[PDB]
Amino acid sequence: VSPPPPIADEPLTVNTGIYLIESYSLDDCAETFKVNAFLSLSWKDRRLAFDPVRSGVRVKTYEPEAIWIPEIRFVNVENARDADVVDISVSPDGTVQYLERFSARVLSPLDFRRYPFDSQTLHIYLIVRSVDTRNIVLAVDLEKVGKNDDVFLTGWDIESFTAVVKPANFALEDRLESKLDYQLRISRQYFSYIPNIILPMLFILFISWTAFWSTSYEANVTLVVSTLIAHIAFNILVETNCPKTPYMTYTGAIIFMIYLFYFVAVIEVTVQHYLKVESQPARAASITRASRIAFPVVFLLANIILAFLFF
Amino acid sequence: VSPPPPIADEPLTVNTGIYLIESYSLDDCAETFKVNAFLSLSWKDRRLAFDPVRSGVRVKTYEPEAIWIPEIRFVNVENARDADVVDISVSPDGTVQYLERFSARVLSPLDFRRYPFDSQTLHIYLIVRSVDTRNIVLAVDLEKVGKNDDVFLTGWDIESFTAVVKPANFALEDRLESKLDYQLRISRQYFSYIPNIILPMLFILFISWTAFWSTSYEANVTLVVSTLIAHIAFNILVETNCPKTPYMTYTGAIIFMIYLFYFVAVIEVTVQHYLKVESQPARAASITRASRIAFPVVFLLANIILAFLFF
Amino acid sequence: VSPPPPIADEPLTVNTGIYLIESYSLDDCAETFKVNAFLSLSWKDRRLAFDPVRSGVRVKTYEPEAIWIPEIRFVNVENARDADVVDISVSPDGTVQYLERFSARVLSPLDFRRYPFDSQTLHIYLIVRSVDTRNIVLAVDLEKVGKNDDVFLTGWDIESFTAVVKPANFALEDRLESKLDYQLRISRQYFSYIPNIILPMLFILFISWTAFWSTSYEANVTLVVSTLIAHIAFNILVETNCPKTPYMTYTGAIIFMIYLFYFVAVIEVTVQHYLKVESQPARAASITRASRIAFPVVFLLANIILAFLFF
Amino acid sequence: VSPPPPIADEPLTVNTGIYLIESYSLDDCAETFKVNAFLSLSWKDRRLAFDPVRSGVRVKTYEPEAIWIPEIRFVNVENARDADVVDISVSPDGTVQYLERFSARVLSPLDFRRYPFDSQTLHIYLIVRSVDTRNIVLAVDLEKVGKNDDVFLTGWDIESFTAVVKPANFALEDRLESKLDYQLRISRQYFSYIPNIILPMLFILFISWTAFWSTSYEANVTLVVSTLIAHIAFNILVETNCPKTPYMTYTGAIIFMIYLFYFVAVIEVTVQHYLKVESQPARAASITRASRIAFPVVFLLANIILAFLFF
Amino acid sequence: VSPPPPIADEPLTVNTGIYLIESYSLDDCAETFKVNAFLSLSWKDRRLAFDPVRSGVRVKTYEPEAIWIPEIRFVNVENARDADVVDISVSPDGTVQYLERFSARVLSPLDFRRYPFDSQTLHIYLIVRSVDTRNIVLAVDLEKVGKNDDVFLTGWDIESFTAVVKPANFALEDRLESKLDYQLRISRQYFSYIPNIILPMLFILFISWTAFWSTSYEANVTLVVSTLIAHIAFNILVETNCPKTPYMTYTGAIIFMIYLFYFVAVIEVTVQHYLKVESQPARAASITRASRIAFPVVFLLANIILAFLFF
Ligand SMILES: [Cl-]
Ligand SMILES: [Cl-]
Ligand SMILES: [Cl-]
Ligand SMILES: [Cl-]
Ligand SMILES: [Cl-]
Ligand code: NA
Ligand code: NA
Ligand code: NA
Ligand code: NA
Ligand code: NA
Ligand SMILES: [Xe]
Ligand SMILES: [Xe]
Ligand SMILES: [Xe]
Ligand SMILES: [Xe]
Ligand SMILES: [Xe]
Ligand SMILES: [Xe]
Ligand SMILES: [Xe]
Ligand SMILES: [Xe]
Ligand SMILES: [Xe]
Ligand SMILES: [Xe]
Ligand SMILES: [Xe]
Ligand SMILES: [Xe]
Ligand SMILES: [Xe]
Ligand SMILES: [Xe]
Ligand SMILES: [Xe]
Ligand SMILES: [Xe]
Ligand SMILES: [Xe]
Ligand SMILES: [Xe]
Ligand SMILES: [Xe]
Ligand SMILES: [Xe]
Ligand SMILES: [Xe]
């Protein structure tokens, strides 16, 4: 078998569609997600056209090996998809209606700059390579693009599953390549983050601030340094232990600031004690009293600046 | 190798049955479970009907490739099941009795709101796509549905394995599809949850409450902050090792409350010391004495409120 | 490609034998072990009998597809075994000497109640489903049941590899199933557990007991609470790395008791200080002096009770 | 299904080309990277020659099984690549133009001496073994070598993808082997390393230096030892998760120096207290005052020496 | 498709050779290593012997299915090797020269008693089972046993790759089996171990010894107990990540001794304080002064004893 001949000079249009059956194993570290879906393909092959009267059948069923089928591949996959041809139906005019069920581990970059208030667009790129006899172009039938109502990703809200109707046609290794962009829009379920991460982290930092209502250097050293240990310990507890980000994230900036605040609070505690020991209790007491307001105010202000910069 | 013809216009009924041989690898983090079972299939194909007299046999055995077999797939699976046809038996009236042994990693959502006192319903969805010449409908042969007595999941009690006899017939990709729901009901058996996680976690919290029978600020700071470190450390030790659930769990609420209590106990310790240092020992001593009763009472009360809200 | 016919009414006997080549990847957490072995099968098919004179050969070699072979499966496996047919030999009377090399991940429950002084019996269940024309029954020749001298599992002593000669014949889905039990007896190598886990864990607990020879509340609080942190930290280090079992283990009871002892020692330290501060140094000194004997004695006694209950 | 015959005695030239579609899963610990690319092959097999006039077609398409294809293997791969033949085109002269899409996990050594300011050259070695009838030699078709613009490796800048045009022809097991070197040059994106790892690690070290403005031995012991705990804790948190490299890395030297500085600061704190207790407050105060300058200066100097030695 | 007949009664000699292409993924915890190599096989079959004058070919090339090939298996493998037949050549005398490229995960026990100053001998056991008509014996072709110069294992020095030329012939399942031992000798690259693990672990222990130049019980308790926490914390950081070995290792003994030393130092600190408080400052001061020498001397001596016992 060889590609169907053109009636004029027109390229062959392969009408696609992807219907999500299952979405699972979204890996934030690897920036990969596992998908189980239907892939529908539709094209016209007049060599396969028939008279339903002199055939006795209104539809003809074929085996994949029996007829010409376009070679559709995915661009952003780990390995080639595991596919199972479900059905191949031919109508009297030569229209081929192909359907397969596939599973694939798709590689899609994730932007964590706004984590855990981030939204992601997961991509699935369909591609077809043209042959010398004729050019092959992809198209989307949006009626055939959908997802099962029970499709889920834990900790995410699945907004929509759509495709960018206009394909990306370009030349590669002296042949035309037609590419389609299938997009799965998801938004993170950030609720439990406040009581599970933020609030306890904030409490530890607030504990370190009680050193501003104490003159005991030994009790102050225990307060700021032991809370720093508790902060690090807490971060180990809730750390995914999975992603080291090249870029600066929102949460990443807050955490860096918290470390800076532990260092500044140590400097204060050190300064206050030194001034007290160096017969200057008026300056020590005035710094400690200022810190009581300065620390929560500078924190609340810098957080507003960060929230503004990232969102 | 075409579907059996209808006697009238009726759809083909494929009688199903699943018998669990082994259940294993239930992953709470991935919301998946590995199953090893028998899949029985029964349908009538009159093209296969024979006279036991002029044949000499009461039953006929066929190879899968020799006869028409419906394409049964699972909806909620990672990849297609690993199947091995055990037996194919045809009776004189054309009744086919198919049996295969399969293994599959099933994706089933889990509700952790009541953990570790939670119960789960694991789902296995059978499906069949109808063909050009006739519609295929699934049915349940209750005689063929069951589980091996030795079937186990560590830390779980297997209540029952049943199927919702009425199939879910709907339209998918312009063809009728009949779906079945097989349910495995399991309840968490975690006898050791109390001694292993709860009690050591409560002991650490109770140690922090000894600061209410002490006036030493240095000893009190060491008590509340060091126990907070011990609490966090203990939670790293008994860590679920599962990514935090988006929703608020029962255990999650108790743990959040424990962090809040560590913060409140710090506030008390800070207030008591400040009042003492600011020549008000009557109000400091009255707060510390109230806390001795207030802390266990508010804890025991809030826990009853939480237990009521979740159960 | 039909089962051999009976001479009278008797069922077909398939003589089995498993010879362990390699045993590896014993996962305590998954309760699974990977095995690489030989599977020998012996049966008589009179349709295969021949005259060695006419044939010119004393033995005949066949391909698996050329002759009838019983469908032997394993009950407690993740997926069907990866098998490679090594040899098929037919003697002039129609006796078949089948041999294959296989690898399989076997699921076998493990009892950790006596850990690390536990012994386990690993099971491999062979099974055959009886066919339409005649019943198939399994048998063992214990001469053919063996293991390579170099077979090993790190941290275990392999006592024996045997089979329960009497098969378990039962009805399942209206047919007979003949099941065989192959047992691998292993006993844990518990020596490094004393210097690596037990002894350092006891030293940490003993350090907390030095608070009974001190009147300094600040030093005592640091002793009991810092050792509790060290205990938890040590447990994180020597993590069994297995999720807590549902049942109460021997080691599990000892560890729970150690947490209880840290709580009791805190109560003592708190009581001592309170009586000392509340003008009662006679009681505080008598309690502390009693604790010096009470704590090691109650510990040593409760440990004897636990060791008695578990063993 | 035999190699093409030589016209004289010349070796067969197989023109190669690799075009990267996707690059992912670069494992620093395993020294491996997963690649998804096109592999183009071109050679002359005159036995496949045809007249485009008699055939009608200007190019002929073949199935891989229909014609002879050179056995190209990769030297540094875990297992043989997962390949999918995209196209096989034969021109009238008998020139074959082969194209396949493959995925492979490539093993390439990584030098971490300059981490996180390191650059790496990832290698892909193509190889062909010569046959009985004729020698096979590899060549590079530069028109067919490249990478997709969207190719990315999280935390890396992809500089270039090139091939060393001159093959390495050598004898192995009495036959000629022609080897090609495909190189992917990458450089690490080290920015978030400063605020995420370096800066919080420096703050903990600086906190330990506040002991040089304190005479309280109890407060000093708490400062240096508690910060050492915080340092270790922080290292557990931002752990590379890679086993210690056999060689001494840049970051490895800095961390070793930080441990040495914690030990030296302890020695100082111990010396200062001993001199004070042994009626020598002039010597104690002069050491502590010197340390205030000595510690940051020696640190800043040794860091310059290390940066010079490694870069 | 029957073994070659013997000229007399001699067994068939299969000359073997393994050439390492790649060595990777050496897992200490799993005691496995992944290998990628060539397997050469040579044997004489006179049924394939031909006259070169009337045939006119250097060597005849065959497909695996076309001729008899001995079934060579590996003893110590997880699953059967992934093999790709590279070449099959037959010379006029009937000498078959077989070559395949394979990948396999080999199970080889590792002795960690001398870690990290250990050397290992990795084993690859070739095996052949004799057949009905004749016995098969393995031999080593030393010209075909080697390794690629670029073969590497991170953290190891690859000394040599050799084979024990004399096979181990024994009876198994009533047939003769000829076994060959291929050995890969490797020695660990222990340099970064001193600055990364040993030296910071000794510094933490040395810090605990500063308690011998202090009379402050509160400062001493903080010294010994906080360093014990730092030691455990450090061990978590540079954790082997391998499950505890059943046997006592060199490093294991040193670490056990370090825990014993922390306990002894606590006893001293406790004894010194008790003697001081129980009006015996002469006895207390003499113990603390002795400990200053006793602790480093006993440590240095016991370490020499351990180093002597293990090496
Ligand atoms: Cl694909
Ligand atoms: Cl399926
Ligand atoms: Cl099986
Ligand atoms: Cl390859
Ligand atoms: Cl093998
Ligand atoms: Na086709
Ligand atoms: Na069929
Ligand atoms: Na057969
Ligand atoms: Na070929
Ligand atoms: Na053969
Ligand atoms: Xe998607
Ligand atoms: Xe955060
Ligand atoms: Xe601040
Ligand atoms: Xe189920
Ligand atoms: Xe909890
Ligand atoms: Xe907190
Ligand atoms: Xe409270
Ligand atoms: Xe077993
Ligand atoms: Xe210890
Ligand atoms: Xe224990
Ligand atoms: Xe506790
Ligand atoms: Xe006790
Ligand atoms: Xe590369
Ligand atoms: Xe910090
Ligand atoms: Xe660093
Ligand atoms: Xe210094
Ligand atoms: Xe090896
Ligand atoms: Xe240190
Ligand atoms: Xe700590
Ligand atoms: Xe060590
Ligand atoms: Xe000692």
Author numbering:
A (entry chain C), B (entry chain D), C (entry chain E), D (entry chain B), E (entry chain A): 5 to 315
Which passages does the manuscript contain on this structure?
In the GLIC LC form, the bottom end of the cavity is obstructed because of a revolving motion of helix M2 and the M2-3 loop, and a conformational flip of the Y197 side chain. Upon channel closure, the revolving motion of the M2-3 loop destabilises this network of interactions and Y197 predominantly adopts a downward conformation stabilized through hydrogen bonding with T255 (M3 helix). Indeed, the xenon-bound GLIC LC structure reveals that the contraction of the intra-subunit cavity constrains xenon binding to one single location at the cavity entrance. This unique xenon binding site has a markedly lower occupation (0.7) than the xenon intra-subunit sites in GLIC open form (0.9–1.0) further illustrating that the reshaping of the intra-subunit cavity in GLIC LC form limits xenon-binding to this cavity. Xenon binds to a novel site located in the pore, in (and only in) GLIC LC form. This site is located in the middle of the channel pore, on the receptor five-fold symmetry axis, between the S230 and I233 rings of residues (respectively S6’ and I9’ in a prime notation that starts from the N-terminus of M2 helix). The inward movement of the M2 helices that occurs during the pore closure reduces the pore radius at position I233 (I9’) from 6 Å in GLIC open to 4 Å in GLIC LC and likely enables optimal hydrophobic interactions with xenon. The Xe atom is surrounded by the side chains of five Ile 233 (I9’) residues at a distance of 4.4 Å. In GLIC open form, xenon binds between M1 and M2 helices from one subunit and M2 helix from the adjacent subunit in the inner part of the TMD while in GLIC LC form, xenon binds between M1 helix from one subunit and M2 and M3 helices from the adjacent subunit in the outer part of the TMD. The location of a xenon atom in a functionally critical region of the pore could easily account for the inhibitory effect of xenon on GLIC.
To improve the understanding of molecular interactions between xenon and transmembrane receptor targets, we investigated xenon binding with the Gloebacter violaceus ligand-gated ion channel (GLIC), a member of the pLGIC family, using X-ray crystallography under pressurized gas. Previously, the sensitivity of GLIC to gaseous anesthetics has been studied using 2-electrode voltage clamping techniques and this revealed that GLIC currents are inhibited by clinical concentrations of xenon. GLIC, whose X-ray structures has been solved in open, locally-closed (LC)–inactive- and resting-state conformations, is extensively used to identify binding sites of general anesthetics, channel blockers, alcohols, and other allosteric modulators in pLGICs. Here, we show by X-ray diffraction that xenon has multiple and specific binding sites in GLIC either in the open and LC (inactive) conformations, and that these binding sites differ between the two conformations.
